[PDB]
Amino acid sequence: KFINTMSQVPTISQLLPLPASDDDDLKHKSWDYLYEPDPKALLDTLLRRYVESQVYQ
């Protein structure tokens, strides 16, 4: 992880089993999407799309 020009830190983060964000998980709102195929199918695609983005960044 790049802290600053003279400090890089070797890091081992756990991606998948999704961890555990209170920020993105605790709150919720009234509305809801209408998923074309089951939302279960999208929750899978998104989960894989996410893990790849993690590895890329």
């Binding site: 809801d32 999407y33 209408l34 998923y35 999208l42 799309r49």
Partner: protein, 138 residues
């Protein structure tokens, strides 16, 4: 007019962001088109062009390799794939990655600046009795 905020982000970079009147995109089901105040929906979208109408009537065209479309209260983002995805094409890339590991084999990184420089550095450093010539501890 009546406009909503569009966001076309790729995994690699942001491709678009601004107020738009409408967008047209090849949905998985068929010709999909979102106008201001569309109902919340989450969908996959097929590869191909996406027509956008920035506010003030200006038009923009963008090829997307497919991706996800997400409309929500007062915001709609297109999470685009950087290359055509699919279980067939994926297993192809996976099998390749597995193979390349079963056989240690060279492959060129792009950098030439580092190439010819690391080479000159290797030749210049080599065969110098320098550490012996000076009296150094190690």
């Amino acid at each position: 007019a009546m406009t909503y905020h569009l966001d076309v982000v790729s995994a690699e970079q942001q491709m678009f962001s601004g107020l738009v009147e409408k967008i047209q995109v090849t949905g998985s089901e068929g010709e999909l088109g979102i106008y201001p105040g569309h109902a919340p929906l989450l969908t996959a979208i097929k590869p191909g062009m996406i027509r956008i109408v920035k506010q003030h009537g200006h038009e923009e065209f963008i090829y997307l390799s497919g991706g996800i479309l997400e409309v929500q209260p007062g915001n709609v983002t297109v999470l685009a794939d950087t290359a055509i995805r699919g279980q067939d094409l994926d297993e192809a890339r996976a099998m390749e990655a597995k193979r390349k590991a079963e056989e240690h084999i060279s492959s060129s990184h792009g950098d030439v600046d580092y190439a010819q420089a690391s080479a000159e550095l290797a030749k210049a450093i080599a065969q110098l009795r320098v550490i012996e010539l000076t009296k150094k501890a190690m």
